[PDB]
Design a protein around this ligand. Structure first.
Ligand code: HEC
Ligand code: HEC
Ligand code: HEC
Ligand code: HEC
Ligand code: HEC
Ligand code: HEC
Ligand SMILES: CCCCCCCCCCCCCCCCCC(=O)OC[C@H](C)OC(=O)CCCCCCCCCCCCCCCCC
Ligand SMILES: CCCCCCCCCCCCCCCCCC(=O)OC[C@H](C)OC(=O)CCCCCCCCCCCCCCCCC
Ligand code: SF4
Ligand code: SF4
Ligand code: SF4
Ligand code: F3S
Lengths: 45, 104, 169, 157, 261, 929
């Protein structure tokens, strides 16, 4: 019961470290819109 | 449990429903100091819709638990409220309260 | 070796309870012992190699290792003799065994088959006097006759007949 | 696919065994044991006067002769006994033309002066070249019904 | 994590071979670490979709950089979770019997048990987590494709992203399929960890048959779940230099929602 | 994990000569009996083709009136034990049987040269008339040969008390159907004794409490340890087991006995008990009885016949017959007279019929060193016992289902032990081994059995007489003739010594394993012990006040140092116990039992001293351990305020004023699920909790009928016992003198079953008959049904529980491979379940269906007695009553409209089919304060 639970964090961080390396950890196109939203509110001044 | 929570999810229906009714009579009589943004009325309609669905999730899961394990200290409420004409108001609460304001 | 040939033996006028006795008494249909098969083959085709396997199982004491073709799993608990007593003939569960040189499965012994026949027995129930008649074909008027036989044989409803204490003990 | 309880750790009515000299889990009974439902000592259960081993061949059937027992024995004659003794009891079955000691025809004087309990005794234990029945019939109400049929089948020559 | 996965795959290869009774579950308490960790792991991925879906209803912009580290954190807290309803059964090779398929048995699942709805919740939760995180990665892996300058890693992100191009006729169709998905994953996760809450509250047990289990479990799912996003993103600023995207106001607001949960 | 696309080619084999009696699929019950101590219990065992699979009670028999004991029921796993001796053994290595008859007959011609001097036999207390006639043929062929009869739970003090009061030896058959009060004295008579099933029915027949019942039994007990009669006792008294000789001397002087010579005074709660038990004995003189068990010395046994002859019970409820056993004046003193003869030679042949005296002897009787002085030691037993290694020769046993034999029960009624099966391993029973010693080695067991009864039948037509004796079981042309007695005076004149201060030891037989003869039986081991629900452990039973003086908890291992020997015993404290009166149980510590009973507990036989063989006061506890395993199966022995839901207990003083005083006249509960219409064969059960003595015969008969697997000691401690029915002690009251109440908790077959609605694959549904169908092939193993079952009567197969005392269940090397000889003990109508499916008491649905389907073929309906479940067909008190609820003239429809009909957990609306008749424990007015 311990080795399946403590082993379950392996399968979490096997896939999480596969997610960090192969895929972006931050949605680039949405934070590009957040950079665009900060610029379009500074240009409203 | 959950019996005050079913009121709490309906305190949100009444005062977002009262949010739109009060900004209607104050709009129809031309008494609002601001014109209503059409984007932020879709916010008040998002809140009215997402609290009809919360209300029908806390009232039905209050019923789903009581109906499933029919303990005789929990079933007398929904047994008095689904028999002798109160069955009609039960079917209203699924269709006229949730499913008719779920689709529209 | 030189196994049982049903097509010759039912053609000898054997009425299907000669061997397989207690198909109207027991929960399990008998396969006949060597004493049945040596009742004729002690002098019918004695000193043959087709029935040398039944002479060797008589001079010695080893039971004949017949191969079961209808191997229902042991969680089913089929009950014979409730079907021949509530009017289900040996066809529509076993095929034309009298026209069978070596017995194969006819039905795959599913669960959905035998549930359609427990939920609606009227499309398969025949009279008890034609249960051991293999040439009985279902009539064009199977319904209103099978429904007549269900209320005559007091055959229980689809609710009581499919609830896994029938099967599955 | 998964076979977990498909074949179990118990023995069915006629399945094989890995324990005995014969392959059967169906084991023979000890020869002088009596079960609870089957005392088998009367003049009904044997075809003799008081159930003696060398008894005296009871001359009529002890159990009753009803029309639904004559009709049952007519059915039970056609299953077991009419294969090589003929349907009408003439010894003219399809196998009876091929048995070397030809099955004696009923209607013969000997089989008529034969006592009725000997007709039971040839059933349940067998004659010389006729192997025993009675493990095929397995009920006293149908062994006597068979010889109730033959005694009525011995009236229509 | 490989030594944790070889502790995972060995504890499962033990579990199938010798049985479900190497765990220590008794007959009074017959649900143990197989279910305490299952509701825990299902509970972790739920605030990974409050960040991904519920906050996208609120048009909030602080959910933006916490998005993929919560969409993917949902999926791997479901793939770690969803094995547990498949392996706590004593005969795990028949968990397809909890699916409504036609067979040569006339048998179907029950659809009154709240473990049959756990099949229906998670196999809807596992597939729309990997459909709302893959839809989010359709316009993003088109940017990793154009920044590759190496054709065997460009073809990898040029096939994961199906060919996206941007485009207002595709950007308008994206967000009306994103906020509807963010509007479909918001009653889902208030229902999933309510359906992983009904499989105690359906039962007549004294500590289990309480009727505030459905909103209090999902409150604890967006309590334990925000704790895992905080436990994972504090070591994703100090190790990957994301101090200018995961700025501390994102933790001031993830702490307020964890407090409000 | 077995896996294949197809099941393999299943072979179906017929016979080669099918016998007439056998129909494949029909049960074919045979009437035999079992020699338990020396007496017959009387059996009706179910042999499907040849193999007996289920022992039931012979309802014609006087001992069992259709219901067996705990030990008598589990003689099937003893029969199909793979640890049985499969071959004879000569000096360690295996051999043949005819090598023995060439070695024994070569030693029998050397004994006829003498006057048969060295031909000692050590059988155990046999009563069977064929072995008596073979002994009396053996002792007239060899003149100086001696037949010693050792039995560790023999009636040694019970027959020495019959000599000390009456002169010659007399058998004492008690009769409790005409008995208002039953003042026992250390007498667990409802135990597995030779008369334990009849004395439990006759005691429970008196207290069947109905709508118009005002007088029931009383049952004053005064027991040393909590014994299973104490569940039926209404005034059980925890006496120190050394004062029971002084409670009877205080009760024989209240009644008229002239020369009682009372001494060693009593406490304030033992004296007000005995002034009220004897006050209820001076009244109702014609129907009252004073009982005393063999734990007591022979003087109080003689006083127990003195009181029963004073009160006029002789001829009324205490009948005196000729002794049914052959040698009543031979016991432990007969074993001690043999080893002092076995020393320094002067013994040449030692036959040992099944006694196991290497293991069973007292410590003062050196049977180990006296053995291996005999040049030819032969042993006859169905196990290679502790003796069979230390014997020169060894034979198989021929367990009673394999051997032609006789046995005489009490009342003298002889019953013929037919073999239901041929001997699997060639058994050569005790009647067949004396045939070798007499000189008839080719004579079979049947040829010497009918040779005796042809000469003991003074009527004509023996074949009618013999076939009827095999059919009915009983003979009853052979009952023990009633003996006119004297009750000589001047036997208790000598005053007893001082009651010695010090902590007392108390020797007991375990109700599961009686004397270790069946310690290799897996069904008896995992069956929970009656008060202390333990499975695989001998314990030292202490009171709560005794362990508080010694400072030891419920699991410490202590080294119980008696007069010269230490035993290294674990501790289970026990509320009903007497003060300073540590009780150890027999049946454990066997070093050569097999794979079940090897090293399970501590051998209590190393503390017997043959002068204090049941109780002595020189014990030193001296704790030497901590935290033993002690795999118990109850969890909480204390009713936690859950009264009105577990065992509603009242007295008869408040029941004669209010009938439904334990019922709660409440409003009908509201259910949102509606209800279903059960109109044909509504199956319900009524468990009379007032008459259940926690005999555990219904636990082990559900095990033998429903193929329930045994679970080892390591997985009982994890609470994974497989028991479809369980008995629940509850210990209401003061922690030193409590009332112990049984709840027979099985699957209540709830109509609104909460265990069914939580099954994802619908592997638990209802019949239209109404009972709960747990289908095993559909169970995927999600243990949610067990969680929603409020009674927790669901039992999950966790590992592959199959043949677990023969292979430890934590491997898959033999998961789908099974022992071949254990497959024959299984019922062919119950699924032998896989690794991950859940079990449940199915009302014995294989017994429901086999008579429901049989009643459909013959177009009738089921009657009441046509379906009798395994827990119902075994209960000696008939506490369990199963039957149709829609049949208006049924037996369970009367028992479920009684004023004591309560269902367990009616706070939940499960609507059970199992209702319980409440407990009424008949308290005296002079003792209830
Ligand atoms: C006419 C009365 C019949 C005879 C003669 C036999 N059957 Fe049946 N049968 C059926 C099933 C589903 C099975 C498998 C059951 C199991 O394996 O437990 C069988 C099997 C047999 C066997 C095999 C038993 C053996 O090997 O000894 C025999 C000899 C046999 N059957 C003869 C199904 C049915 C059925 C549908 C309800 C009926 C009408 C019959 N069988 C009829 C006969
Ligand atoms: C008398 C009623 C019979 C019983 C009982 C059994 N058999 Fe038979 N068998 C019988 C006849 C009259 C014949 C025809 C002989 C010939 O030469 O054709 C047979 C034949 C067979 C055969 C051979 C089939 C062939 O050659 O085409 C076999 C293999 C056979 N029989 C097997 C068999 C078995 C196994 C039996 C016990 C159940 C059995 N027979 C009984 C007549 C009778
Ligand atoms: C004796 C001459 C028989 C007669 C009359 C009938 N059957 Fe039979 N049957 C017999 C034998 C020796 C065997 C085993 C040989 C084999 O091929 O299996 C059988 C077997 C069957 C089976 C298959 C059972 C199984 O193996 O699963 C079936 C389905 C069967 N028999 C049906 C059947 C019917 C319908 C009969 C009346 C026409 C009949 N049998 C007569 C011997 C004899
Ligand atoms: C074919 C296997 C037979 C079956 C079916 C039956 N019988 Fe038969 N029978 C058979 C033979 C080959 C013989 C000749 C015996 C001899 O040694 O010549 C018989 C004989 C009899 C007799 C006459 C007895 C005698 O003359 O000494 C009788 C009365 C008889 N058989 C009765 C009988 C009954 C009642 C049967 C149905 C169960 C039956 N037979 C069937 C062969 C066969
Ligand atoms: C007699 C008509 C039956 C009823 C009342 C039920 N079952 Fe059922 N079952 C039956 C038969 C003939 C089979 C064998 C089919 C085959 O060989 O594939 C089965 C089998 C099953 C299974 C399959 C088990 C496995 O493949 O390992 C299951 C899961 C099963 N049966 C379940 C089941 C349930 C839940 C029922 C509830 C009322 C039930 N069965 C009734 C015949 C019958
Ligand atoms: C092949 C798997 C199969 C199994 C297992 C099976 N049946 Fe039946 N069965 C019946 C009928 C008709 C009854 C009688 C119902 C009654 O008497 O209540 C019955 C009854 C039964 C009973 C007895 C119920 C009782 O009350 O004891 C059992 C057991 C049973 N069936 C099992 C028609 C069928 C038919 C129709 C041709 C099929 C096929 C059939 N049955 C297939 C099967
Ligand atoms: C983690 C996974 C689950 C994710 C979470 C749940 C989300 C929903 C999932 C829905 C889909 C689940 C599919 C379940 C299939 C069950 C079938 C089965 O297990 O059969 C087992 C049986 C022993 O097998 C058999 O009876 C036959 C065995 C042989 C057939 C093999 C079939 C394999 C299918 C692939 C076919 C490829 C070609 C192979 C052909 C066969 C060659 C031998
Ligand atoms: C992972 C999720 C799988 C969900 C379904 C579980 C199937 C279990 C099973 O089929 O057991 C096979 C066999 C009993 O098991 C065995 O005998 C061998 C199992 C070894 C498997 C090793 C890998 C573990 C599974 C990954
Ligand atoms: S008593 Fe327990 S096991 Fe029996 S039906 Fe009710 S919930 Fe299920
Ligand atoms: S009725 Fe149920 S609990 Fe009782 S013995 Fe039978 S199966 Fe076991
Ligand atoms: S119910 Fe019967 S068998 Fe079970 S413990 Fe009580 S008296 Fe003994
Ligand atoms: S709920 Fe369902 S499948 Fe198995 S163990 Fe419990 S039955």
């Amino acid at each position: 019961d311990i080795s399946l639970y403590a082993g379950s964090f392996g399968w979490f961080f096997f896939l999480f470290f596969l997610f960090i390396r192969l895929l972006p950890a931050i949605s680039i196109f949405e934070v590009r819109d957040l950079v665009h939203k900060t610029e379009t509110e500074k240009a409203l001044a | 449990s959950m019996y005050p929570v079913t009121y709490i999810a309906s305190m949100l229906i009444l005062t977002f429903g009262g949010g739109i009714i009060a900004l209607a009579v104050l709009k129809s009589r031309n008494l609002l100091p601001f014109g209503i943004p059409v984007d932020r009325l879709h916010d008040l309609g998002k809140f009215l819709f997402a609290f009809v669905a919360v209300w029908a999730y806390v009232n039905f899961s209050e019923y789903l638990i009581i109906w499933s394990g029919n303990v005789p200290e929990l079933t007398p409420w929904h047994g008095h409220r689904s028999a002798g004409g109160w069955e009609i108001l039960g079917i209203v609460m699924i269709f006229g309260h949730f499913l008719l304001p779920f689709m529209l | 070796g030189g196994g049982f040939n049903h097509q010759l033996h039912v053609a000898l006028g054997m009425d299907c309870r000669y061997c397989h006795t207690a198909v109207e008494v027991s929960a399990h249909a008998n396969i006949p012992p060597t004493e049945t098969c040596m009742g004729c083959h002690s002098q019918i085709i004695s000193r043959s190699e087709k029935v040398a396997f039944v002479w060797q199982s008589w001079e010695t004491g080893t039971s004949i290792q017949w191969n079961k073709v209808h191997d229902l799993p042991k969680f089913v608990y089929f009950n014979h003799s409730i079907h021949v007593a509530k009017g289900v003939g040996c066809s529509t569960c076993h095929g034309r065994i009298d026209q069978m040189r070596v017995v194969y499965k006819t039905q795959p012994l599913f669960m959905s088959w035998c549930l359609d026949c427990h939920r609606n027995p009227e499309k398969y129930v025949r009279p008890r006097e034609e249960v051991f008649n293999m040439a009985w074909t279902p009539p064009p008027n199977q319904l209103e006759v099978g429904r007549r036989l269900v209320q005559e044989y007091e055959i229980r409803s689809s609710w009581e007949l499919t609830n896994c204490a029938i099967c599955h003990r | 696919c998964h076979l977990e309880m498909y074949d179990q750790a118990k023995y069915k009515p006629q399945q094989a065994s890995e324990i005995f000299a014969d392959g059967a889990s169906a084991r023979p009974l000890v020869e002088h044991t009596v079960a609870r439902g089957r005392l088998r000592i009367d003049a009904t259960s044997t075809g003799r006067v008081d159930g003696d081993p060398n008894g005296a061949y009871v001359t009529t059937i002890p159990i009753r002769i009803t029309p639904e027992l004559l009709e049952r024995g007519a059915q039970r004659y056609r299953i077991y006994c009419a294969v090589c003794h003929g349907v009408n009891g003439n010894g003219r079955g399809q196998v009876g033309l091929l048995l070397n000691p030809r099955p004696p025809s009923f209607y013969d004087q000997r089989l008529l002066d034969m006592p009725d309990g000997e007709y039971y005794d040839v059933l349940v234990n067998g004659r010389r070249t006729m192997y025993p029945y009675g493990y095929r019939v397995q009920s006293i109400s149908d062994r006597w019904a068979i010889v109730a049929h033959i005694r009525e089948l011995q009236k229509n020559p | 994590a490989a030594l944790g996965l070889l502790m995972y795959l060995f504890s499962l290869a033990v579990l199938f071979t010798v049985g479900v009774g190497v765990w220590g579950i008794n007959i009074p308490v017959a649900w143990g670490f197989d279910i305490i960790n299952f509701v825990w792991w299902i509970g972790i991925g739920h605030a990974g979709t409050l960040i991904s879906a519920i906050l996208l209803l609120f048009r909030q912009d602080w959910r933006t950089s916490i998005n993929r580290a919560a969409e993917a954190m949902t999926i791997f807290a479901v793939a770690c979770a969803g094995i547990y309803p498949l392996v706590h059964t004593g005969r795990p090779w028949l968990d397809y019997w909890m699916l409504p398929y036609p067979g040569t048995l006339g048998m179907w699942p029950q659809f009154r048990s709240a473990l049959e709805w756990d099949v229906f919740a998670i196999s809807t939760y596992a597939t729309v987590s990997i459909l709302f995180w893959y839809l989010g990665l359709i316009p993003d892996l088109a940017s990793l494709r154009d920044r590759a300058t190496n054709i065997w890693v460009k073809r990898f992100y040029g096939f994961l992203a199906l060919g996206w191009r941007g485009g207002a006729r595709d950007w308008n169709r994206y967000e009306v399929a994103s906020l509807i998905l963010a509007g479909l994953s918001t009653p889902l996760v208030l229902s999933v960890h309510s359906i992983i809450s009904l499989d105690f509250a359906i039962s007549q047990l004294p500590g289990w048959h309480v009727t505030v289990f459905p909103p209090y479990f999902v409150a604890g799912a967006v309590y334990c779940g925000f704790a895992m996003v905080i436990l994972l993103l504090v070591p994703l600023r100090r190790w990957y230099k994301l101090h200018d995207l995961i700025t501390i106001k994102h933790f001031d607001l993830m702490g307020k929602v964890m407090l409000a949960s | 994990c077995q896996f294949a696309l197809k099941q393999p080619q299943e072979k179906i084999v017929p016979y080669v000569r099918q016998p007439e009696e056998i129909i494949h699929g029909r049960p074919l019950f045979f009437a035999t009996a079992v020699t338990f101590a020396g007496f017959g219990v009387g059996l009706l065992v179910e042999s499907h083709e040849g193999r007996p699979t289920k022992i039931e009670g012979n309802p014609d028999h006087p001992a069992s009136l259709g219901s067996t004991d705990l030990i008598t029921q589990a003689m099937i796993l003893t029969m199909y034990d793979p640890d049985r001796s499969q071959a004879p053994t000569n000096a360690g290595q295996e051999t043949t049987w005819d090598a023995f008859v060439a070695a024994a007959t070569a030693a029998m011609q050397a004994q006829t040269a003498k006057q048969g001097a060295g031909l000692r036999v050590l059988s155990g207390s046999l009563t069977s008339p064929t072995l008596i006639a073979q002994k009396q043929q053996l002792l007239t062929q060899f003149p100086q040969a001696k037949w010693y009869e050792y039995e560790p739970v023999g009636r040694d003090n019970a027959n020495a008390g019959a000599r000390l009061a009456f002169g010659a030896d007399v058998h004492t058959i008690y009769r409790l159907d005409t008995a208002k009060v039953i003042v026992g004295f250390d007498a667990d008579f409802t135990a597995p004794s030779p008369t334990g099933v009849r004395m439990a029915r006759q005691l429970a027949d008196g207290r069947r409490i109905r709508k118009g019942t005002k007088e029931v039994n009383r049952l004053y007990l005064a027991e040393s340890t909590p014994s299973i009669t104490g569940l039926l006792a209404d005034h059980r008294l925890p006496v120190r087991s050394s004062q029971i000789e002084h409670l009877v001397r205080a009760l024989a002087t209240l009644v008229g006995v002239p020369n009682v010579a009372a001494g060693a005074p009593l406490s304030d709660t033992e004296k007000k008990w005995v002034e009220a038990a004897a006050k209820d004995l001076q009244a109702n003189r014609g129907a009252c009885v004073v009982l005393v068990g063999e734990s007591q010395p022979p003087v109080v046994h003689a006083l127990g016949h003195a009181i029963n002859a004073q009160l006029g019970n002789v001829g009324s409820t205490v009948v005196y017959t000729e002794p049914v056993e052959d040698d009543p004046s031979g016991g432990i003193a007969a074993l001690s007279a043999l080893t002092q003869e076995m020393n320094a030679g002067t013994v040449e042949v030692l036959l040992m019929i099944e006694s196991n005296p290497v293991y069973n002897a007292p410590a003062d009787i050196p049977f180990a060193e006296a053995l291996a002085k005999v040049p030819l030691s032969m042993h006859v037993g169905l196990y290679r016992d502790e003796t069979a290694q230390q014997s020169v020769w060894h034979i198989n046993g021929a367990h009673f289902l394999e051997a032609w034999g006789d046995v005489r029960a009490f009342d003298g009624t002889t019953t013929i032990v037919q073999p239901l099966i041929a001997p699997l391993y060639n058994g050569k029973s005790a009647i067949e081994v004396l045939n070798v010693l007499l000189g008839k080695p080719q004579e079979t067991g049947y040829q010497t059995l009918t040779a005796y009864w042809q000469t003991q039948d003074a009527s004509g037509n023996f074949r009618v007489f013999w076939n009827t004796a095999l059919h009915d079981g009983v003979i009853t042309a052979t009952q023990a003739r009633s003996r006119q007695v004297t009750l000589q005076q001047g036997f208790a004149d000598a005053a007893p010594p001082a009651p010695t201060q010090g902590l007392e030891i108390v020797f007991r037989p375990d109700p599961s394993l009686w004397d270790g003869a069946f310690a290799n039986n897996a069904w008896l081991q995992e069956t929970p012990k009656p008060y202390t629900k333990l499975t695989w452990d001998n314990v030292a039973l202490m009171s709560v006040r005794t362990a508080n003086a010694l400072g030891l908890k419920n699991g410490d291992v202590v080294r119980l140092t008696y007069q010269g020997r230490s035993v290294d015993a674990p501790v289970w404290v026990q509320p009903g116990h007497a003060d300073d009166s540590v009780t150890v149980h027999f049946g454990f510590g066997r070093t050569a039992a097999g794979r079940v009973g090897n090293n399970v507990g501590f051998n209590a036989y190393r503390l017997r001293t043959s002068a204090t063989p049941w109780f002595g006061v020189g014990l030193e506890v001296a704790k030497v351990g901590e935290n033993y395993k002690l795999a118990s199966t109850q969890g909480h022995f204390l009713m936690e305020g859950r009264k009105k839901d577990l065992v509603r207990y009242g007295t008869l003083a408040e029941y004669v004023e209010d009938e439904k005083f334990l019922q709660v006249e409440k409003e009908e509960p509201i259910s949102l699920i509606g209800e279903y219409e059960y109109n044909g064969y509504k199956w319900g059960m009524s468990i009379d909790l007032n008459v259940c003595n926690s005999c555990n015969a219904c636990v082990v008969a559900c095990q033998s009928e429903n193929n329930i697997p045994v679970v080892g000691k390591d997985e009982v401690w994890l609470g994974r016992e497989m028991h479809w029915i369980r008995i629940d002690q509850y210990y209401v009251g003061d922690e030193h003198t409590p009332n112990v109440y049984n709840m027979v908790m099985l699957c209540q077959q709830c109509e609104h079953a909460p265990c069914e609605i939580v099954c994802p694959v619908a592997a638990t549904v209802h019949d239209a008959e109404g009972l709960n169908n747990m289908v095993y092939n559909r169970c995927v193993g999600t243990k949610y049904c067990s969680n929603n079952c409020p009674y927790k009567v669901r039992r999950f197969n966790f590992l592959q529980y199959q043949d677990v005392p023969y292979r430890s269940p934590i491997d898959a090397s033999t998961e789908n491979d099974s022992i071949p000889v254990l497959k024959m003990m299984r019922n062919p109508d119950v699924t032998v379940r896989a690794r991950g499916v859940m079990e449940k008491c199915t009302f014995c649905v294989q017994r429901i269906n086999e008579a429901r389907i049989q009643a459909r073929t013959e177009n009738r309906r089921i009657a009441d007695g046509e379906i009798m479940t395994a827990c119902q067909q075994v209960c000696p008190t008939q506490a369990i009553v199963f039957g149709d609820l829609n049949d208006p003239q049924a037996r369970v429809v009367d028992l479920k409209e009684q004023p004591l009909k309560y269902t367990s957990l009616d706070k939940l609306n499960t609507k059970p089919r199992v209702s319980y008749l409440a407990k009424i424990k008949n308290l005296n007015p002079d003792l209830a304060e």
